[PDB]
């Protein structure tokens, strides 16, 4: 009911700074707690620069639920928002 | 003083047409740019008594209006011949707005209005009845540089508006009912009004205002 | 009327307010036995050619009768009219060195009423122009305006900068830009123009208070300022008489005051 | 008074009742970081100089564009299709110029903020494509035209099919698309600036990318900053 169909979003498709501060802090917390990586590591040992990897090659397994003032939401997964 | 008096009998007469004409009622083109001298010569004797009785007139709406508004009934505009104004003068105009079937009414007084007249106003169902001041009807305020255009939404608009934003009724920003500019445009009770607005980072900027 | 200075005299003249306090330099009671003639030898002549034994004097001040560019007719007309026929005047022309005009209570101890009338005729007689506006000023406004070939150039009119504030009454007055006025007190453009035009005044007034010594601040903060100042079609104070009044929650409420 | 006030993803501006105190954020959804000072270009000078750096004639001569910069002065002169299209753009300046000149800057005021600083990619993509050597370039009016329109239907403030939205859309982005429609002239591009057509697209490109960049982020406090 207060979803919203993938076809009839009408959010900006890019990821905004609050947004990506968000899940870079979860991401990295996520690692820390040994949760499976989805990139390579290749020399860095900081939990937020394997975040910071993973969202760079948009490989972070987390969906974003923007809230309508209404009460409705909108899923974006982070694999289909833009990142600067 | 006379001729004074005149020619502000003559912009009040010119500033209740301009509000007629904008509240969607036809009024006639040579009507509108009617002079000084010719108002003089139709309206005040020989003397150069006013005759106020004589100023009270009809319009109707434009099928534009009818169309786009669907509430619009008959106009009768009324100037009141004496300044003050008895319960019984409102009495007989209420009695006469009853008998003339008008859906709308606009009554004007000189100096004041007595607060007993103001008591049985909302007993004129199902017609309307808005009280103006002479006075205060001498220079036209949608006119000013500082007043923007205000224009009534019908109730398709104002649907329409409130599924685009997702809003109720209170969420939107409130006009009063005494705002000039509402009287101006007789606004009522839950109707919303659009406002195009010049801006300095955009150029154009358009904003709704719902009647309290 | 901006291009002509003449014009804009006259009409800063017609607005000033202007009472007969604001020209009656000295006030004197008189007994006077016979009403065909008068003890005094400044005004025998006068009362010779134009004609209770109490009489009402009034001395004016030649510089400021001159300054107000008013006559002895338009004062003595007002002064008749102000009162109907319930007292009797007889008023002087130029040619009488003491810029007399007389008054008599007419017959129907009375020095108290007597009094208590030139208190009234000292207070409440008002001869022309818009009630509270103390003072006028004629200000040079230089705006730029573009010309036959499009060019925008400096151009010179003239303004006025009055003290006090009555909107409606003159901008009701002839030969005045109706469409123009404006006023500094917010409160007086919503009693009289509305809540966009009163919005437009409170930026304005903040963005002069913000920009008269130099400093910017961006238009969105003002505009966001002045549209939550009005936003429920009448001003909010910033305090606790406008924040506090709010439907929002108490525990938002109850933090602030 | 100003605590509760945020930004939404509607674009929006409402306290914490709901309550819209804006319907866009500073009247063009943008953040008060990413605009600066720029001059509109229409809007000073008389109606003989406005004519003589916009208006375009195939016609003449004289009043066409110079041989020497353009590889396609040969089939140019005469044309019926490449004049009415200079036509309509020099129509949508002159609207531009009555549209600012009237209602929103009557004092002739020209500088003022606005984002994405068209001066700076215009030189930054002259120094980085080495548009020197008086080189002729090799852009056609209708590309110019009609990816000027394209750019101007692409900078997306809110996104949506409704027509409030398409309104709204346009009202936000008036001021920007006349600053860009000045700076992006036809006889600006092909005399003043001289760009290819490389030159040409990495210059919308990066109008469009700055223009998305400049926006304003959702769930901004507005009301305290």
Known sequence: ELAILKEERTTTPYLTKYERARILGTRALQISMNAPVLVDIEGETDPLQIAMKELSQRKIPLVIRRYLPDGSYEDWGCDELIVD | ?212 | IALDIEKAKVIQSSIEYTTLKNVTSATEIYYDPDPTSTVIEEDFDTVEAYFSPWLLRLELDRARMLDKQLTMNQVADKISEVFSDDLFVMWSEDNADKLIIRCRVIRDEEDQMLKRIEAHMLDLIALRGIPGISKVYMVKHKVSVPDESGEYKNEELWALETDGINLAEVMAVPGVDSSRTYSNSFVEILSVLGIEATRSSLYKEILNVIAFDGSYVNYRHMALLVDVMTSRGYLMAITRHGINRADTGALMRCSFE | ALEDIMVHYDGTTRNSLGDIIQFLYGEDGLDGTQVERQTIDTIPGSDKAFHKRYYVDLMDEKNSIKPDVIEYAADILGDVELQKELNSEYEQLVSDRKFLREIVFVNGDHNWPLPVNLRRIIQNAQQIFHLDRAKASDLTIPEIIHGVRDLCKKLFVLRGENELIKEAQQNATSLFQCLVRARLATRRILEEFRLNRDAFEWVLGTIEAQFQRSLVHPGEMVGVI
């Open chain 2, 1 to 212: 003083d006379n001729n004074r008096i005149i020619s502000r009998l003559w912009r009040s007469f010119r500033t209740v047409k301009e509000m007629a004409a904008d509240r969607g009622y036809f009024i006639s083109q040579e009507e509108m740019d009617q002079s000084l001298e010719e108002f003089r010569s139709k309206i005040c004797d020989s003397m150069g008594n006013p005759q106020r009785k004589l100023m009270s007139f009809l319009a109707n709406p434009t099928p534009e209006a009818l169309e786009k508004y669907s509430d619009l009934g008959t106009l009768w505009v009324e100037f009141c011949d004496e300044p003050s104004v008895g319960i019984k003068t409102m009495r007989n105009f209420c009695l006469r707005i009853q008998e003339k079937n008008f859906s709308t009414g606009i009554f004007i007084y000189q100096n004041n209005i007595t607060p007993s007249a103001n008591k049985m106003i909302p007993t004129v169902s199902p017609a309307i009845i808005e009280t103006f001041q002479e006075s205060d009807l001498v220079v036209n305020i949608t006119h000013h540089e500082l007043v923007p255009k205000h224009i009534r939404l019908s109730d398709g608009e104002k649907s329409q508006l409130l599924q685009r934003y997702k809003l109720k009724e209170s969420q939107l920003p409130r006009i009063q009912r005494e705002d000039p500019v509402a009287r101006y445009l007789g606004l009522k009770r839950g109707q919303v009004v659009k406002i195009i607005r010049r801006s300095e980072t955009s150029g154009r900027y358009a904003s709704y205002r719902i009647c309290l």
